Design a binder for this molecule. Structure first.
Ligand SMILES: [Zn+2]
Ligand SMILES: [Zn+2]
Ligand SMILES: [Zn+2]
Ligand SMILES: [Zn+2]
Lengths: 378, 378
């Protein structure tokens, strides 16, 4: 019986950047109007969590509870919440879908600005305060989700209600990395059957691009990485050719153009390296090739090219959460998963507990790690 | 009766960069296989001609006969030429349309690769030589057209056959600037009715962007130029709001975003300045705004931005000849002109003679000059 009451539970707190996370007993306040309190059962670590932890984000607010890929069960809801109720199985999402703002109503984008003025600064809309504290001191939320915790509080416009038979230690991946890569292909690029595709970076997101391209009927799916072992792992996701830039004196974009007689029809940058973003554009075919930025670059870094690349017909764009509408389409992706129409399981290479989260951070520097999933019960 | 003979005629020869054009008596060889010799009656000056006369082209292909906006009458054709014959009224195009190469057959671009390996280095495909000389000394072609002459030789895949009743001192403008601007809107951007658009640079190309946008049903048509005298002319072409960047302490992109509550639906850069190209991208609306590079930057200049601009929904692209297929659609543009559906006359602010071409070059520095048309008869 926890409705209307503070909950005390375990969470990993980041007190300062580039230092080990601390497991604490934190207090989680009840949900206010338009809010959902969620019992988080499984959560995965994403490089975006490490971006802010590693001090690379000048907007980083500390102390905070990181985490944004997760799945769990609603414990209670606040005033006026009707789309979910206690007991529902849910995926909290960094990308909200309010269906009422200028962006939601435009029909032109999947962005939503309803709760950005709070979630971007680690607080809640209804009272401009945080629902987390430890030893009497408030803690910042992160990305509107804060899932490295046994319980979190999120805005209702960011909660997807999913099939209650779907295994929660698998579908936690569908809150970020996998939909970002799939939708880069299906929504942003709109890749046609028979297309030639290049994928720069063969981590989780690049492998989901490969799956999206394979599902859509692409012909050549060329992976580019400096770690050739990543190619062996990538084969089951659809990568069917590989180039290591270190094997060639010519710049990688020229090697790709030579290999495809002119360049690829689509390219995808999945690392967040601006120098690789330039190479990805320049390897696109003259007259029509399109390059999609998928990885998130570090603050202040700029992409560059000579404008004749665009004047002679290449197109530069990018994707946020693969162009998907979270509350409407994340449940559809869970349906497809349950039908064996999209891969999820194969991305999960490690399973740890929340108490071992610092070991999970260490696995981010392991090439064989794609996604580590953490059980929050221990 | 000049068919098969060498013609001696007047032409403006550029012997060295940044030195005055020289009015010469030149020899024009007869056309070979797949070539067409054209009596040029009127030709207009374009910034691109002066861009090359000034060393911003790194190729240094001098002496040369510049010029690529012209209209005239076929004098003779070479072996194999069937689409035009002597007497036909024609516009030569710097953008070929062979209908047979990988680019033409793709259906995805208006670029054509058939003759560029020759026209790009100032010669003809058939024998890799020039058709121009002055007293034994060969002269490079320019852009496949070389229209600062009373006669020129071009490739048959570069000749548009037009309505014989159209006035040649007017439709010479349909060889470059006006279709570039119109097609940036209709073909590359595909601007929808109700759109808000921003146009950077209010010379000929940008005014044609305004006409294109007005015809397509755009709502707000915002002109941006550092010369506030250009606003009064631009109003005649559909611009209905104006910003001078020199009046603002803030970067112009942020001014535009504030003025349109988020940014424009489409922007067009019509100057060739890479810093303005960046501003045109960053003034596009988050989630969906699209920026088209229309102007040609100097060799080596790079465009730059922060990749989050693309990740959050903006699209960067560019256009060549407005996305028009030259042999097929330049005659259609002439028909639109004859039915008073597109403007052409209004862009012509000066009329001079080919003999006065150095005087006309100085007008390219005048804000009040849009297009100068030259009569080649003297
Ligand atoms: Zn919304
Ligand atoms: Zn993520
Ligand atoms: Zn062609
Ligand atoms: Zn031109």
């Amino acid at each position: 019986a926890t409705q209307g009451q503070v909950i005390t539970c375990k969470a990993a707190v980041a007190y300062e950047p580039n230092k080990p996370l601390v497991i604490e007993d934190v207090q989680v306040a009840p949900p206010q109007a338009g809010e959902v309190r969620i019992k988080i059962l499984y959560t995965a670590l994403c490089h975006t969590d490490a971006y802010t932890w590693s001090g690379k984000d000048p907007e980083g607010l500390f102390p905070c509870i990181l985490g944004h890929e997760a799945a769990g069960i609603v414990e209670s809801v606040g005033e006026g919440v009707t789309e979910v109720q206690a007991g529902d199985h849910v995926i909290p999402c960094y990308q909200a879908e309010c269906r009422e703002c200028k962006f939601c109503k435009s029909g032109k984008t999947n962005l939503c600005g309803k709760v950005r003025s709070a979630t971007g600064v680690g607080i809640m809309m209804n009272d401009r305060k945080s629902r987390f504290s430890v030893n009497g001191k408030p803690i910042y939320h992160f990305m509107g989700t804060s899932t490295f915790s046994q319980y979190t509080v999120v805005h209702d416009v960011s909660v997807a209600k999913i099939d209650p038979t779907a295994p929660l230690d698998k579908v936690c991946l569908l809150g970020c990395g996998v939909p970002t890569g799939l939708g880069a292909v299906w929504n942003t690029a709109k890749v046609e059957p028979g297309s030639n595709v290049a994928i720069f970076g063969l981590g989780t997101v690049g492998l989901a691009v490969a799956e999206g391209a394979k599902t859509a009927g692409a012909s050549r799916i060329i992976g580019i990485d400096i770690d050739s072992k990543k190619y062996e792992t990538a084969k089951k996701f659809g990568v069917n050719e590989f180039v290591n830039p270190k094997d060639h004196d010519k710049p990688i974009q020229e090697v790709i153009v030579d290999l495809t007689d002119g360049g690829v029809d689509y390219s995808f940058e999945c690392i967040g390296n601006v120098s690789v973003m330039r190479a990805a554009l320049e390897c696109c075919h003259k007259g029509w090739g399109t390059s999609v930025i998928v990885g998130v670059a570090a603050s202040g870094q700029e992409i560059s090219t000579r404008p004749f690349q665009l004047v002679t017909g290449r197109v530069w764009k990018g994707t946020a959460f693969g162009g998907f509408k979270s509350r409407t389409q994340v449940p559809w992706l869970v349906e497809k998963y349950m039908n064996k129409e999209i891969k999820v399981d194969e991305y999960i290479t490690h399973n740890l507990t929340l108490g071992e989260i610092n070991k999970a951070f260490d696995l981010l520097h392991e090439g064989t790690c794609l996604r580590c999933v953490l059980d929050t019960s221990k």
